[PDB]
mmCIF file of C-alpha atoms in Angstrom:
data_model
loop_
_atom_site.group_PDB
_atom_site.id
_atom_site.type_symbol
_atom_site.label_atom_id
_atom_site.label_comp_id
_atom_site.label_asym_id
_atom_site.label_seq_id
_atom_site.Cartn_x
_atom_site.Cartn_y
_atom_site.Cartn_z
ATOM 1 C CA UNK A 1 10.273 -13.656 26.893
ATOM 2 C CA UNK A 2 9.775 -10.412 25.018
ATOM 3 C CA UNK A 3 7.044 -7.862 25.323
ATOM 4 C CA UNK A 4 5.931 -5.401 22.679
ATOM 5 C CA UNK A 5 6.582 -1.665 22.871
ATOM 6 C CA UNK A 6 -5.247 8.366 15.741
ATOM 7 C CA UNK A 7 -5.977 6.182 12.767
ATOM 8 C CA UNK A 8 -9.453 7.652 12.510
ATOM 9 C CA UNK A 9 -8.119 11.191 12.325
ATOM 10 C CA UNK A 10 -5.599 10.245 9.668
ATOM 11 C CA UNK A 11 -8.118 8.441 7.522
ATOM 12 C CA UNK A 12 -10.513 11.396 7.848
ATOM 13 C CA UNK A 13 -7.776 13.661 6.582
ATOM 14 C CA UNK A 14 -6.804 11.306 3.758
ATOM 15 C CA UNK A 15 -10.430 10.897 2.696
ATOM 16 C CA UNK A 16 -10.844 14.694 2.680
ATOM 17 C CA UNK A 17 -7.757 15.061 0.518
ATOM 18 C CA UNK A 18 -9.119 12.297 -1.676
ATOM 19 C CA UNK A 19 -6.566 9.513 -1.732
ATOM 20 C CA UNK A 20 -8.118 7.231 0.842
ATOM 21 C CA UNK A 21 -10.977 5.746 -1.175
ATOM 22 C CA UNK A 22 -12.691 3.746 1.547
ATOM 23 C CA UNK A 23 -14.724 0.710 0.491
ATOM 24 C CA UNK A 24 -13.587 0.013 -3.053
ATOM 25 C CA UNK A 25 -12.521 -3.491 -4.206
ATOM 26 C CA UNK A 26 -9.279 -4.485 -5.892
ATOM 27 C CA UNK A 27 -11.157 -4.532 -9.228
ATOM 28 C CA UNK A 28 -12.563 -1.057 -8.721
ATOM 29 C CA UNK A 29 -9.055 0.186 -7.840
ATOM 30 C CA UNK A 30 -7.698 -1.358 -11.044
ATOM 31 C CA UNK A 31 -10.283 0.696 -12.964
ATOM 32 C CA UNK A 32 -9.341 3.914 -11.107
ATOM 33 C CA UNK A 33 -5.671 3.429 -11.860
ATOM 34 C CA UNK A 34 -6.129 2.259 -15.507
ATOM 35 C CA UNK A 35 -5.264 5.647 -17.045
ATOM 36 C CA UNK A 36 -2.904 7.292 -14.607
ATOM 37 C CA UNK A 37 0.884 7.355 -14.833
ATOM 38 C CA UNK A 38 3.038 4.554 -13.431
ATOM 39 C CA UNK A 39 3.828 5.168 -9.790
ATOM 40 C CA UNK A 40 0.373 6.499 -8.978
ATOM 41 C CA UNK A 41 -1.267 4.999 -5.907
ATOM 42 C CA UNK A 42 -4.226 4.998 -3.564
ATOM 43 C CA UNK A 43 -5.210 3.588 -0.199
ATOM 44 C CA UNK A 44 -8.469 1.748 0.339
ATOM 45 C CA UNK A 45 -10.195 -0.755 2.549
ATOM 46 C CA UNK A 46 -9.094 -4.394 2.188
ATOM 47 C CA UNK A 47 -11.678 -6.985 1.242
ATOM 48 C CA UNK A 48 -9.789 -9.600 3.289
ATOM 49 C CA UNK A 49 -11.055 -10.190 6.822
ATOM 50 C CA UNK A 50 -7.461 -10.389 8.102
ATOM 51 C CA UNK A 51 -6.687 -6.750 7.135
ATOM 52 C CA UNK A 52 -8.276 -3.329 7.259
ATOM 53 C CA UNK A 53 -6.369 -1.454 4.554
ATOM 54 C CA UNK A 54 -4.669 -2.029 1.224
ATOM 55 C CA UNK A 55 -2.391 -0.058 -1.081
ATOM 56 C CA UNK A 56 -3.021 -0.186 -4.831
ATOM 57 C CA UNK A 57 -0.405 1.150 -7.217
ATOM 58 C CA UNK A 58 0.423 1.305 -10.938
ATOM 59 C CA UNK A 59 3.623 -0.112 -12.449
ATOM 60 C CA UNK A 60 4.655 -1.395 -15.855
ATOM 61 C CA UNK A 61 1.108 -1.708 -17.259
ATOM 62 C CA UNK A 62 -0.337 -3.414 -14.208
ATOM 63 C CA UNK A 63 -2.141 -2.343 -11.064
ATOM 64 C CA UNK A 64 -0.658 -4.177 -8.113
ATOM 65 C CA UNK A 65 -1.988 -4.441 -4.578
ATOM 66 C CA UNK A 66 -0.598 -5.072 -1.106
ATOM 67 C CA UNK A 67 -2.192 -5.191 2.314
ATOM 68 C CA UNK A 68 -1.185 -3.032 5.213
ATOM 69 C CA UNK A 69 -0.663 -4.540 8.667
ATOM 70 C CA UNK A 70 -1.546 -2.485 11.759
ATOM 71 C CA UNK A 71 -0.503 -3.600 15.201
ATOM 72 C CA UNK A 72 0.842 -2.024 18.389
ATOM 73 C CA UNK A 73 0.089 1.440 17.009
ATOM 74 C CA UNK A 74 2.320 0.888 13.981
ATOM 75 C CA UNK A 75 1.945 0.045 10.308
ATOM 76 C CA UNK A 76 3.845 -2.049 7.798
ATOM 77 C CA UNK A 77 3.105 -3.863 4.612
ATOM 78 C CA UNK A 78 1.804 -7.383 5.132
ATOM 79 C CA UNK A 79 4.050 -10.440 5.258
ATOM 80 C CA UNK A 80 6.945 -8.397 6.592
ATOM 81 C CA UNK A 81 7.821 -10.305 9.773
ATOM 82 C CA UNK A 82 10.154 -8.675 12.311
ATOM 83 C CA UNK A 83 9.984 -5.047 11.095
ATOM 84 C CA UNK A 84 9.696 -1.952 13.317
ATOM 85 C CA UNK A 85 6.914 -0.353 11.313
ATOM 86 C CA UNK A 86 5.808 3.264 11.128
ATOM 87 C CA UNK A 87 3.526 5.335 13.329
ATOM 88 C CA UNK A 88 1.095 6.328 10.550
ATOM 89 C CA UNK A 89 -0.102 5.370 7.116
ATOM 90 C CA UNK A 90 1.440 8.571 5.779
ATOM 91 C CA UNK A 91 4.797 7.759 7.407
ATOM 92 C CA UNK A 92 4.654 4.201 5.905
ATOM 93 C CA UNK A 93 3.953 5.614 2.442
ATOM 94 C CA UNK A 94 6.505 8.394 2.761
ATOM 95 C CA UNK A 95 9.133 5.841 3.710
ATOM 96 C CA UNK A 96 8.219 3.812 0.648
ATOM 97 C CA UNK A 97 8.403 6.880 -1.581
ATOM 98 C CA UNK A 98 11.880 7.594 -0.210
ATOM 99 C CA UNK A 99 12.905 3.978 -0.888
ATOM 100 C CA UNK A 100 11.465 4.382 -4.418
ATOM 101 C CA UNK A 101 13.668 7.470 -4.913
ATOM 102 C CA UNK A 102 16.764 5.420 -3.948
ATOM 103 C CA UNK A 103 15.891 2.300 -5.968
ATOM 104 C CA UNK A 104 14.931 0.209 -2.909
ATOM 105 C CA UNK A 105 11.123 -0.042 -3.297
ATOM 106 C CA UNK A 106 10.455 -3.446 -4.826
ATOM 107 C CA UNK A 107 7.993 -6.284 -4.762
ATOM 108 C CA UNK A 108 7.922 -10.038 -5.117
ATOM 109 C CA UNK A 109 5.194 -12.490 -6.106
ATOM 110 C CA UNK A 110 6.327 -14.991 -3.417
ATOM 111 C CA UNK A 111 7.943 -15.044 -0.001
ATOM 112 C CA UNK A 112 9.921 -18.147 -0.872
ATOM 113 C CA UNK A 113 13.616 -17.520 -0.117
ATOM 114 C CA UNK A 114 15.295 -16.403 -3.316
ATOM 115 C CA UNK A 115 12.164 -14.995 -4.955
ATOM 116 C CA UNK A 116 12.886 -12.285 -7.529
ATOM 117 C CA UNK A 117 12.136 -8.674 -6.690
ATOM 118 C CA UNK A 118 11.009 -6.017 -9.119
ATOM 119 C CA UNK A 119 11.524 -2.281 -8.727
ATOM 120 C CA UNK A 120 8.699 0.217 -8.670
ATOM 121 C CA UNK A 121 8.970 4.077 -8.614
ATOM 122 C CA UNK A 122 6.057 5.584 -6.648
ATOM 123 C CA UNK A 123 4.920 9.025 -7.527
ATOM 124 C CA UNK A 124 1.589 10.592 -6.612
ATOM 125 C CA UNK A 125 -1.576 9.746 -4.738
ATOM 126 C CA UNK A 126 -4.740 9.549 -6.799
ATOM 127 C CA UNK A 127 -7.761 11.607 -5.718
ATOM 128 C CA UNK A 128 -11.262 10.232 -5.701
ATOM 129 C CA UNK A 129 -12.706 13.689 -6.481
ATOM 130 C CA UNK A 130 -13.702 14.654 -10.014
ATOM 131 C CA UNK A 131 -11.724 17.892 -9.723
ATOM 132 C CA UNK B 1 -5.308 -11.356 -7.967
ATOM 133 C CA UNK B 2 -2.337 -8.981 -8.538
ATOM 134 C CA UNK B 3 -1.424 -8.981 -4.780
ATOM 135 C CA UNK B 4 2.316 -8.698 -4.196
ATOM 136 C CA UNK B 5 4.751 -8.539 -1.267
ATOM 137 C CA UNK B 6 6.856 -5.462 -0.615
ATOM 138 C CA UNK B 7 10.480 -6.291 0.175
ATOM 139 C CA UNK B 8 11.399 -4.970 3.620
ATOM 140 C CA UNK B 9 14.129 -2.259 3.854
#
């Protein structure tokens, strides 16, 4: 029975600050994050037709990626059914940073029930600008 | 492909 309850301006701001990289692939992002400290991250366009944006981040010698879902004016990470979401990309990331600070930011390699989760500590956005 | 799922909190 239930019913449901500016992205451009944000992305303009994040591009101007440098940490929204626009149309780079997962492989390009891996290169950009190869020599930055663990926890570093960036936002970019997703190559998958089902999504517009992805988060790439460094942890434990690996660059990992996740897609961002955007619906009903809100944002979440993908494959998170039945979540409230956040009203901006920045709010989504800030929430995740706060979870990282508490030891609650973690990932899995499967959504099978019982899949292991692995902690990651996020730090700093990575700028696309050479200085 | 190094894509992972963030655990919801």
